[PDB]
Amino acid sequence: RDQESSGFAWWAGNARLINLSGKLLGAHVAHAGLIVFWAGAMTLFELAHFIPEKPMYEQGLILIPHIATLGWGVGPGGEVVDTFPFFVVGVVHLISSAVLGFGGVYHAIRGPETLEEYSSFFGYDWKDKNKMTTILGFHLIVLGIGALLLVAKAMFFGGLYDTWAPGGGDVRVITNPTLDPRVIFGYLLKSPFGGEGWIVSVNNLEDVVGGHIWIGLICIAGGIWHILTTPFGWARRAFIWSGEAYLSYSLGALSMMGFIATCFVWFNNTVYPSEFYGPTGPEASQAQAMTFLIRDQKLGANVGSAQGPTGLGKYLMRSPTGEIIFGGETMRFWDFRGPWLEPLRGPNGLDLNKIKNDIQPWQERRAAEYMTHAPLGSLNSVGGVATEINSVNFVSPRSWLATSHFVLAFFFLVGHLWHAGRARAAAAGFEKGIDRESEPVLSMPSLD
Amino acid sequence: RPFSDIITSVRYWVIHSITIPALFIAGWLFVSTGLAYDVFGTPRPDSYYAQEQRSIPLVTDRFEAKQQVETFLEQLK
Amino acid sequence: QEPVSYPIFTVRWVAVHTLAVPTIFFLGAIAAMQFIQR
Amino acid sequence: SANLWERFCNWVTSTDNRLYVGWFGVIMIPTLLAATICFVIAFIAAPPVDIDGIREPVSGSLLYGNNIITGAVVPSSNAIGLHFYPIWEAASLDEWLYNGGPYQLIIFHFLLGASCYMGRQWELSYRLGMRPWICVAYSAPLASAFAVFLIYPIGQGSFSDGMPLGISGTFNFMIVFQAEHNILMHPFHQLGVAGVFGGALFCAMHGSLVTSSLIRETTETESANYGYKFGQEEETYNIVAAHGYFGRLIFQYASFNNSRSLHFFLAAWPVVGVWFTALGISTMAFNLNGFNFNHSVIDAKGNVINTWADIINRANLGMEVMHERNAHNFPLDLA
Amino acid sequence: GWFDILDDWLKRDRFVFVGWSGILLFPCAYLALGGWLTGTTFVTSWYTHGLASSYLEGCNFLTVAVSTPANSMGHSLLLLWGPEAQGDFTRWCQLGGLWTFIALHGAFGLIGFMLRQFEIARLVGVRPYNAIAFSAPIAVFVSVFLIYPLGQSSWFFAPSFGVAAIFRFLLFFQGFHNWTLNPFHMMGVAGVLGGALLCAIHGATVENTLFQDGEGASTFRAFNPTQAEETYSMVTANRFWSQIFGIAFSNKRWLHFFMLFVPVTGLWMSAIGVVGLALNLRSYDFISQEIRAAEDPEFETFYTKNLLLNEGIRAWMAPQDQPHENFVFPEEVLPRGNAL
Amino acid sequence: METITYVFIFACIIALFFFAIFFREPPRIT
Amino acid sequence: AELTPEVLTVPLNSEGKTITLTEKQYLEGKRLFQYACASCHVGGITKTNPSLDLRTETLALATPPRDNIEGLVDYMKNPTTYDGEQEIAEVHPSLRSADIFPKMRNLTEKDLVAIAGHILVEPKILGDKWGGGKVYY
Ligand SMILES: CCCCCCCCCCCCCCCCCC(=O)OC[C@H](CO[C@@H]1O[C@H](COC2O[C@H](CO)[C@H](O)[C@H](O)[C@H]2O)[C@H](O)[C@H](O)[C@H]1O)OC(=O)CCCCCCCCCCCCCCCCC
Ligand code: CLA
Ligand code: CLA
Ligand code: CLA
Ligand code: CLA
Ligand SMILES: CC(C)=CCC/C(C)=C/CC/C(C)=C/CC/C(C)=C/CC/C(C)=C/CC/C(C)=C/CC/C(C)=C/CC/C(C)=C/CC/C(C)=C/CC1=CC(=O)C(C)=C(C)C1=O
Ligand SMILES: [Ca+2]
Ligand SMILES: [Fe+2]
């Protein structure tokens, strides 16, 4: 048979395609089909259940909210206007899944089992440092165009959902992308700890759009550069050149992006609007303080001077560097910033005068909403604390996303280690056992 | 006789296509006919408490236990 | 061994049988339970 | 000199070192010496730490009233949260020891080094011509320290919520965890105990089967161990006799005869199970907790009929309601 | 003589070896497994713990269980035909007769099984270290499901057979016995945890220290079911660990005996600790700590902290966990921190 | 008095460690 | 041990007159109560202000009386403070403010009556549980 047990074992079947470019193409074309299929098929599933007059986060949605962010079918405050863009994006993908799926199935069971001969342009050689650097170069451009495909939707075709909208959350057209490298790349030099949050600290659409402009170019630039080159010297005396080794490198890459994504959806307020997803972890703990400082203040309590059990400040206290923040266990989230809460902040943090008479109703109910929709829930979807009662069936989209992606991100890091460990033994050549005859260890002096 | 052979013999299925669903439909009826509830003294959704009472029918003494249990069924529990 | 005869009512049959019939008599009840309303 | 640096690289990487200081080692050896040295001093002489940011210092060192079982190195303050607190961030050490500075210096260096320790478990295998993957087995216990020392804190918003470095301090981490996440009722933890229980189980199975089927080469009054010489050609036990016994205990096809498949299973089981346990803590770090079956079964009128799931909730409430006495000022525990 | 003929038959090599032992093992082992599976789906724990405990009532695989007998029963064996049930079956069920049934039966079933190992070992002519090992699990079952409740007021405080019903057994022990602080429980875990390490570590050491005996990648087929040479480089393994950990085995006979020892010793210790919890002779407190905490209100260790967690567990659980005590704890008496 | 006892045993285990790693019986082949 | 019509017969107005709900309305209310209340009133308490619960007695001493279908219904349309001396429709879901609390848009007089009925029926079944909090879980 073209490929059977005298290749690899059954459960390692797909490794039998390591050297059949053609068929190995069907896989990638058939697979890429499953992703479009899902994206498409799921969107329609979401929409089929979607209830306009009800929070998205209260409906187990995770795609419609992705579209909403790009400014589609929504308006003032994340209000859903037209469900058409959703239905569209959904069906379109679903269709393209059939097109791709066709090609996949075709290239894997009819077309050429190898490519090198049925066209030397597409056929390839793993150790062919140039073909590799080049195909990589092609893809580095396709991805680059994509990065601009966003910059376009935002600057020309409609905008994106800006929750920080001056008049209050709303679809806004970005016509002033931050292009200043000093700022853009500044983010990469930002600490990943409390406060300075690195990439996840992005907090306005200009930088988002601006930064994507830079990536699109920088990306396509490298796409051409690889098309027009070969790895230098070190680049060659450093890496392993093989089918597995290349995989591994891309495995460790996704893993890392998987962890970064987990933190983005968990912490970021901007590119993940609390209006479509739920309120952030810190955002919800903040809202409780808001809610009760607001309540009790109406009962005649002077929030500014209230002393709590420990003598720290029931409602307001100070952070380690002097700024006025909310008190209680919520002292850990004093780095939370959000449309609803900002108008209360002064140059020194929460201003006792604004808190004292500028709190607006929409804020009181925002704080209440977010307080009662914190990202706490159970596997069987029972919103709240582990000791809560059944009734409110809910688990924040931010919790779902974050966990799923930490698991995937993780296992992929194992995947990395595994495929990289195999590649290094494969190269030097011992990934199948120690040479009974020449057993390396046996030629080394005894350390004893 | 090597399971493999048996799980493949048309005789087998000819026998079990009858036997298996047989056993299934039986147990089903065991529950659906309310018989199981009596075989195991297990309360029906409407038999944990008497209408008003909110107390539990806790057996409180070993020897006169069975007797005590019977009385618990009395208060229409 | 032997002109490959084999008896119908073997030995292991029992072992796999006392764990057989019951397994179904239950998985048949347990399903019918799902329809018990409040 | 063939070239200093050329030489250096030959030593570092030398497979003739008593202890293989590798490339990963160059990062490991220092970070691990700092973590260890700071810990030992802390655990013995560090002063009380305001772990909960409420100015209520918890002393956890020997010289300040603790014994081995109670003593621990306390987590950085909650006032600090996830902020980086390197010594050079404090007006003084006195201030640094009070806000639990030592904790970070330790967890960060340890986690750093323990990773390189993995990177090393690969390198040496390479320099020796043996297959990799051992380091992948060690990815499980490491992925746990990570989950318990970093993921959980990132997820929860503070390092003060990371597992303390001490015996009792750990039980605290557990008891509270259970209350806030109901972990015992989470699939991942269960897979965890299956792997650990199972491991110990299998560890005993293998261990016994093998040891019990050893070929006789020893006296009646001579350690049965001597019947083995380091650097033997053939095997020291009858793996066919082993399989013969075990196959009869349960039944043949339910028994291993392939030493390679046996040993893969032997490694696969615990590592896979612990991987899930680590993903459990890393998952409940974002509040996706265990199953909540509170008041599920209710009777014909609407009354709540308790299950063991409920008796578990009461025990959890006790923990909830009593942990961190003075740290809460509001109704919901969202932190 | 019939005896040797009875023997002959039994010790006959079938698919599922019977043996003399089987005459005890199979009857019991099946009844134990059967009773569980029965109660799990049919019998309730209402008259016993005021709890729904079977599929028939609405419980799922986690919440279901064969709950212990009432506390009134005491240590009664609760025989189907005894003073309690009085031959009646349904009553027996409602009085938790199914617990002592599963308990006592399974108990003999563990005896039979170990005997089996012993019997089969003898026949096959191998050493009985598989039986010695299994003493560990017996001890656990014996001390926990029998010795323990035998020291308490009754079977009611023994662990009920079920998933969740076991988690409360855990939480209970923390809350009431402060079991995690017990030297023996610790050894216990050091063994199980440490045993699950040897398991994983040895397995990987073997799979990645193998010689090449085939031309394939999937090296599983490359194994000689018929001894001969060592299938993995014991010599290479030694050098590996000797350079990465500093210490390393070098006597497969010892490396394997060690693997029997570690987890069997661990479980034995965890048992003794419980045999002591029967008399409530727990490892609850450290007196020197309590004395300083009394006189000085600013002294706080992770230990004192824990004890407070226990107080809460006891106060908030005791009521629905010990029904026979008709506990009534007014809201004002319930220990609680601020706000929560 | 207690502190001293705890640290001593610890110090003794580390000493053991040393001797075990660097003063084991060299592991001889065949 | 069942939810009879009796358990469903709850006070309609202030002048003693009563109404009897049906197992359909009940379930329906229970569903609606989850759709627009549980969020904050899970189990009869009030997360964003634990001082005021849905216990029938609490609603009895409210002002005006909110312990009957008529009462709760008015409330779901034009909410007030416990002394009634102040309208709060701006920070509490209600019909006159569905633009601000969308979940309240669908809600029709039929729905409002069910939700109201649920509130008076629950404590009848659960009792102390309904009012109190975790203490009773
Ligand atoms: C070394 C080898 C390693 C091998 C490892 C292999 C790993 C394999 C992993 C496989 C699967 C992982 C599955 C994760 C499942 C998550 C299921 C879930 O989220 O499910 C959610 C649902 C929902 O349950 C329902 O939840 C419901 C309600 O929620 C809510 O509904 C209410 C209204 O109804 C209200 O709205 C309320 O507010 C709202 O929250 C109701 O309460 C229902 O009554 C309740 O039934 O799950 C249910 O029903 C669940 C019934 C579940 C039984 C589950 C068993 C799970 C795992 C067992 C593992 C055993 C392992 C042994 C291992 C041995 C060796 C390794
Ligand atoms: C997820 C994607 C995926 C893909 C794309 C492939 C692809 C492929 N595999 Mg794997 N494989 C997978 C997962 C996957 N595999 C998994 C999970 C396992 C472990 C269970 C294996 C185990 C395995 C082994 C052991 C072997 C392969 C082999 C092969 C090749 C087989 C060619 C053949 O004879 O097909 C046979 C296919 C059919 C009879 C029907 C296939 C129908 C598919 C294509 C489509 C279904 C969709 C729908 C009906 C199509 C409509 C499309 C629409 C547009 C009209 C092929 C390149 C073989 C190989 O190495 O070849 C060189 C081989 O020996 N695979
Ligand atoms: C993902 C990568 C991928 C790659 C590298 C290939 C490569 C190839 N295919 Mg496949 N194919 C794919 C996906 C892919 N295909 C999918 C998803 C399907 C399902 C419809 C097919 C269906 C398919 C069939 C039915 C056949 C091939 C054939 C061929 C080979 C044709 C020879 C050639 O160069 O003409 C490729 C042709 C063109 C480039 C002209 C197409 C012009 C229009 C209609 C489309 C242009 C597409 C794109 C948007 C252009 C961007 C321009 C840019 C400036 C913006 C070639 C090796 C043929 C073959 O068997 O060769 C041996 C053949 O009969 N392919
Ligand atoms: C197995 C199933 C699986 C599933 C269902 C998902 C699903 C998802 N992942 Mg995920 N992931 C997985 C596995 C999976 N992942 C694995 C194994 C990894 C590696 C660890 C990751 C790593 C990962 C990361 C790092 C991230 C996600 C994210 C996401 C979400 C992305 C939404 C999106 O638009 O797609 C991505 C879509 C594309 C790449 C297509 C490009 C489209 C461009 C070209 C155009 C867009 C249109 C343009 C703006 C309009 C212009 C019009 C013009 C006329 C002007 C989505 C819910 C993201 C997220 O939002 O998380 C919260 C995120 O940041 N995933
Ligand atoms: C991102 C891309 C990626 C790609 C292209 C590959 C590709 C490949 N991997 Mg790899 N891997 C990855 C990521 C990736 N991996 C990660 C992240 C991990 C860490 C866990 C691994 C771990 C891994 C191992 C340990 C092995 C491979 C192997 C292989 C080869 C297998 C051939 C085969 O038939 O597999 C088909 C695979 C299976 C049939 C696996 C069975 C999976 C079952 C247990 C679960 C499926 C779960 C499902 C998604 C959930 C629903 C379950 C249901 C019961 C409810 C193949 C070349 C094998 C090899 O020979 O490599 C050289 C091998 O031994 N991989
Ligand atoms: C002053 C200060 C700072 C004081 C104290 C600081 C502090 C916190 C100290 C904490 C320590 C402490 C008090 C701990 C308490 C726990 C404790 C002491 C319990 C003791 C009692 C106890 C558990 C008794 C019995 C139970 C038991 C058997 C436990 C066993 C645990 C154990 C040794 C597990 C093994 C772990 C391990 C690394 C094994 C490695 C095995 C080996 C090296 C593998 C290498 C190897 C693998 C192969 O496969 C092959 C083929 C070969 C050839 C080979 O080589
Ligand atoms: Ca009914
Ligand atoms: Fe072994």
Coordinates of C-alpha atoms in Angstrom, one line a residue, chain E residues 82 91 105 120 128 149-150 198 201 209 223-224 243 247 267 286 309-310 323:
Chain E
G82 CA -32.0 -9.6 61.9
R91 CA -37.3 -2.2 55.1
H105 CA -19.2 -8.7 51.4
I120 CA -2.2 -18.5 41.5
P128 CA 4.1 -13.8 46.3
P149 CA -16.7 3.6 62.5
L150 CA -16.2 0.8 65.0
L198 CA 8.5 6.4 40.6
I201 CA 9.8 8.6 36.2
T209 CA 16.7 4.9 27.1
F223 CA 10.4 -6.0 21.5
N224 CA 11.5 -9.5 22.3
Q243 CA 24.5 13.8 36.1
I247 CA 21.8 10.2 42.4
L267 CA -0.8 3.4 52.6
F286 CA 0.0 22.1 68.9
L309 CA -11.5 27.2 58.8
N310 CA -12.3 24.0 60.8
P323 CA -29.5 14.7 61.7

